[PDB]
Amino acid sequence: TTPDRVHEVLGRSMLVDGLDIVLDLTRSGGSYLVDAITGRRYLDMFTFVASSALGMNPPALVDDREFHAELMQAALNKPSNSDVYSVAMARFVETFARVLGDPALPHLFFVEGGALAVENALKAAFDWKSRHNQAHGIDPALGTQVLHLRGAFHGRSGYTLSLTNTKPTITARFPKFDWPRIDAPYMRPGLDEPAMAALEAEALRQARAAFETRPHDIACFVAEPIQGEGGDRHFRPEFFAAMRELCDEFDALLIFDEVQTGCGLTGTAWAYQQLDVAPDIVAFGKKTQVCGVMAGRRVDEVADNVFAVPSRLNSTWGGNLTDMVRARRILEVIEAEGLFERAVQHGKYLRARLDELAADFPAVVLDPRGRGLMCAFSLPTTADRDELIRQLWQRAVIVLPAGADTVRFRPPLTVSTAEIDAAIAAVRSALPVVT
Amino acid sequence: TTPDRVHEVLGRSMLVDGLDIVLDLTRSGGSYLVDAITGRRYLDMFTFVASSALGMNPPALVDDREFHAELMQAALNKPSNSDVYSVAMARFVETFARVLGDPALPHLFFVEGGALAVENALKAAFDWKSRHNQAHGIDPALGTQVLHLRGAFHGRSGYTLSLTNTKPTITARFPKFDWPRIDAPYMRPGLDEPAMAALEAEALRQARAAFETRPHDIACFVAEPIQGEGGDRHFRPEFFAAMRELCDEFDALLIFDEVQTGCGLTGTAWAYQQLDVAPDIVAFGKKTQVCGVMAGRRVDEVADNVFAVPSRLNSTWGGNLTDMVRARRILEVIEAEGLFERAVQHGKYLRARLDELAADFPAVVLDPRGRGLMCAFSLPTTADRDELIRQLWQRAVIVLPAGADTVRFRPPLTVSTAEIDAAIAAVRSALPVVT
Numbered sequence: 001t002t003p004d005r006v007h008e009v010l011g012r013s014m015l016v017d018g019l020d021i022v023l024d025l026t027r028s029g030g031s032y033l034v035d036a037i038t039g040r041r042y043l044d045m046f047t048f049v050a051s052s053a054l055g056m057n058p059p060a061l062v063d064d065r066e067f068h069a070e071l072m073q074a075a076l077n078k079p080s081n082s083d084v085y086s087v088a089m090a091r092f093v094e095t096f097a098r099v100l101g102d103p104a105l106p107h108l109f110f111v112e113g114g115a116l117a118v119e120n121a122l123k124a125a126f127d128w129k130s131r132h133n134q135a136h137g138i139d140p141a142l143g144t145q146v147l148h149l150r151g152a153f154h155g156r157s158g159y160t161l162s163l164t165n166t167k168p169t170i171t172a173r174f175p176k177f178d179w180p181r182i183d184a185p186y187m188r189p190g191l192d193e194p195a196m197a198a199l200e201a202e203a204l205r206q207a208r209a210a211f212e213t214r215p216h217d218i219a220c221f222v223a224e225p226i227q228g229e230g231g232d233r234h235f236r237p238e239f240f241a242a243m244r245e246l247c248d249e250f251d252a253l254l255i256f257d258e259v260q261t262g263c264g265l266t267g268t269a270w271a272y273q274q275l276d277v278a279p280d281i282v283a284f285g286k287k288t289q290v291c292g293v294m295a296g297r298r299v300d301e302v303a304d305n306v307f308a309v310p311s312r313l314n315s316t317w318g319g320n321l322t323d324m325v326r327a328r329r330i331l332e333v334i335e336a337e338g339l340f341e342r343a344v345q346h347g348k349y350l351r352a353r354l355d356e357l358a359a360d361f362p363a364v365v366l367d368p369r370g371r372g373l374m375c376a377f378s379l380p381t382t383a384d385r386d387e388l389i390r391q392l393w394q395r396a397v398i399v400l401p402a403g404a405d406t407v408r409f410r411p412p413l414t415v416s417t418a419e420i421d422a423a424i425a426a427v428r429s430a431l432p433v434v435t
Numbered sequence: 436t437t438p439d440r441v442h443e444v445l446g447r448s449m450l451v452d453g454l455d456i457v458l459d460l461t462r463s464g465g466s467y468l469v470d471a472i473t474g475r476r477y478l479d480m481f482t483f484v485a486s487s488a489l490g491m492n493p494p495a496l497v498d499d500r501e502f503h504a505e506l507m508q509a510a511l512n513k514p515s516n517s518d519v520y521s522v523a524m525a526r527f528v529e530t531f532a533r534v535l536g537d538p539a540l541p542h543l544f545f546v547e548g549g550a551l552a553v554e555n556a557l558k559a560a561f562d563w564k565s566r567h568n569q570a571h572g573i574d575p576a577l578g579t580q581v582l583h584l585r586g587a588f589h590g591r592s593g594y595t596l597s598l599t600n601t602k603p604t605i606t607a608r609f610p611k612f613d614w615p616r617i618d619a620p621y622m623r624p625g626l627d628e629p630a631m632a633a634l635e636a637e638a639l640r641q642a643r644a645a646f647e648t649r650p651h652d653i654a655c656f657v658a659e660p661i662q663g664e665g666g667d668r669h670f671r672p673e674f675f676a677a678m679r680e681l682c683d684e685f686d687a688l689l690i691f692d693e694v695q696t697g698c699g700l701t702g703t704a705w706a707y708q709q710l711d712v713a714p715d716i717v718a719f720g721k722k723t724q725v726c727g728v729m730a731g732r733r734v735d736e737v738a739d740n741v742f743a744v745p746s747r748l749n750s751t752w753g754g755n756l757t758d759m760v761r762a763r764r765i766l767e768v769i770e771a772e773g774l775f776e777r778a779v780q781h782g783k784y785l786r787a788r789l790d791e792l793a794a795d796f797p798a799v800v801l802d803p804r805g806r807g808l809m810c811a812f813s814l815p816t817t818a819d820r821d822e823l824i825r826q827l828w829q830r831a832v833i834v835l836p837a838g839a840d841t842v843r844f845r846p847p848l849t850v851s852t853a854e855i856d857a858a859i860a861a862v863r864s865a866l867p868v869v870t
């Protein structure tokens with residue numbers, strides 16, 4: 001079948017609501033997607049929903065003939081890594097630990113899919129709480145609830161549907177656990193230190209109330225360090241530091257969902273490293289290709305936890321071996337080329353341009369914000385936001401919406417300042433048209 | 436790192452409870468795994484937990500230089516197939532529909548992981564029931580329960596943990612929905628037609644009672660056509676035909692979990708094709724590499740079902756593109772070489788040898804059984820079963836346990852009769868030692 005027949009062929013079997021283009025797998029590269037139908041190049045600030053660290057066909061991978069052989073060996077088959085170990089697997093695991101590891105979180109577990117990474121973090125917590133309860137004369141049937149935020153997105157699986165609360169479309173008509181949900185005290189424009197502190201105190205009150213009215217039954221608090229799908233909502237470190245203390249007071253684990261923030265986007269391996277809060281468990285995915293959890297801190301206080309006892313966590317494959325081999329090469333590039341530091345510097349650049357945009361269009365470009373390359377701004381109404389996205393598409397720039405009124409930038413870690421300038425130039429061209 | 440250091444490297448980060456070997460990715464082939472440490476060849480009746488249709492490094496894939504180029508193009512990157520379409524993707528989808536498709540089940544949806552394939556089938560059903568309820572003046576809050584079997588294994592995710600009930604280790608201390616569970620009327624040795632009919636009638640009574648006491652609230656019945664992890668338990672077609680009628684009487688969907696039975700193992704594309712029962716939805720995975728659902732029949736009666744309305748089902752990647760390209764080549768081999776028919780004929784061979792074994796060891800080899808290459812027998816006690824597996828391992832034959840006392844065979848579709856003879860020869864050698 002031919003590029004111009006792709007949408008037709010797929011439309012016989014599936015709902016085809018994606019992009020108008022057909023991806024050219026060979027000619028795409030770096031910060032550009034190529035439409036196989038026209039040959040038009042599209043500037044990529046979307047990166048497969050932030051799941052591509054280096055963009056398409058990175059030179060370091062494409063030109064590495066030794067790596068080609070290793071990738072081909074992995075790609076021909078699909079072993080169950082749960083049961084059957086390989087050198088390819090071990091090299092990925094040791095490089096993951098070296099580049100992204102945290103000495104407090106030594107337990108690694110891999111799985112296909114970001115929602116399942118979050119679920120395995122939850123399962124670790126439910127088990128830990130029940131066993132901790134038991135060891136202290138509390139009923140082991142207690143420890144089954146998850147404290148979480150309004151505006152959270154943690155995935156579309158059985159447990160994470162009880163947590164995710166962004167668009168009603170995602171969760172409607174699906175059975176859910178009644179788990180406690182608190183307000184998200186995110187930073188907003190024109191709130192001073194004491195105004196922020198008061199917003200945080202209210203969420204903290206709600207959190208405490210949940211712990212006190214469901215005694216011994218809350219296993220964990222889970223959060224995104226920056227809420228992505230909910231609208232690039234950033235939180236002060238003070239808020240998470242307070243939650244860290246409150247979790248310890250009630251013997252509950254703190255879990256960060258770094259599926260979107262992780263692997264260098266904010267300028268450090270993990271966003272939590274910049275907030276100075278130590279989680280007990282971190283769920284990761286997207287840019288890591290293989291998904292999973294890192295666990296430690298208080299997890300180790302329960303000797304028969306899910307990382308110590310066989311068959312408590314599992315899947316058939318234990319992650320995709322091809323993804324492991326690709327991720328390990330990507331991690332080596334990140335380490336070798338200092339890409340976390342590049343994210344810091346280019347992230348400062350992108351943010352400075354967004355501040356400039358806000359200065360030039362004060363009633364239109366609202367709340368420019370970001371940490372590293374994870375940047376966004378908002379529009380007055382959702383109609384303006386939707387129109388801006390259409391205008392950018394017409395100009396061959398791909399960006400994603402978030403929430404009711406946000407436009408988010410998700411460039412690759414390898415983005416150049418000229419590429420950022422081109423994205424900003426397109427936004428400047430489009431804005432007078434939307435107003 | 437070196438083959439002899441693999442277990443050491445992994446043991447720093449993970450629980451290492453898998454096989455003693457290190458898989459040689461290059462030298463393994465067909466029905467043999469090669470240990471990279473010793474060079475010892477292992478006869479493979481395990482196939483990555485039945486997830487390998489052709490075994491390792493099939494010649495048709497390894498020798499196909501055009502396919503190498505296509506696989507490499509897919510393997511270098513990992514697009515979000517949910518949003519971004521490719522020729523590689525469309526070719527997989529059209530070949531999937533051609534080789535495994537059912538004209539009554541035209542809606543296809545793909546995802547990474549077998550538990551999530553089952554979950555998306557459940558989500559389709561919950562949505563369908565709620566919308567069907569609504570369209571008939573019933574409260575749309577109703578339609579949230581799943582009728583299922585004792586001994587079922589449907590995965591380890593948030594919804595499937597409420598269904599799976601084999602070993603307590605899998606489900607203990609994890610929150611669950613209270614969903615109705617009925618006895619499984621599987622075939623057992625020394626039960627005649629009327630004895631079987633009476634067992635089935637009792638499960639059918641329990642099913643009816645569930646529908647009557649939870650009115651409008653059961654969205655679906657889900658079953659494995661042959662229960663795998665629970666012990667290779669086979670059901671008469673009569674039982675599923677009765678369940679099909681009862682589902683229609685109470686406006687509930689029938690879903691088969693073919694993750695283990697599917698893609699030719701029983702001798703047809705799907706096990707349900709041999710039971711003459713039409714499901715509304717089928718979940719697939721393992722051998723298909725990419726997982727997902729096929730849906731149709733009554734699903735289409737609700738016009739705004741989950742396959743017709745954007746954003747009701749989703750994941751970031753929409754399945755792994757590398758898996759799609761590999762699966763499409765595997766499907767082409769199956770079709771070209773008549774592998775379903777080969778499974779029928781070699782399955783008859785394997786079963787005949789197991790009958791012979793039962794004749795020679797009547798108090799030890801119990802209940803030889805199978806459909807196609809999906810075959811098993813049981814031992815008197817779990818200690819005998821565990822010992823037989825150890826004895827086979829010592830003889831370089833890999834098989835899997837199931838349930839309390841079952842040994843299961845999961846050979847590749849390409850297994851030869853000489854390879855089956857070698858497996859049977861090892862069982863014959865080991866048996867006197869276990870007795």
Ligand SMILES: *Cc1c(COP(=O)(O)O)cnc(C)c1O
Binds near residue numbers: 154155156224
């Ligand atoms: C991407 C996303 C997930 C879900 O990951 P999938 O691979 O789509 O299931 C979970 N949490 C966050 C914060 C996400 O961005």
Ligand SMILES: *Cc1c(COP(=O)(O)O)cnc(C)c1O
Binds near residue numbers: 315317591695720721
């Ligand atoms: C393999 C299995 C699953 C779970 O699939 P995973 O990929 O391990 O999540 C679901 N149902 C059945 C019948 C299975 O055999």
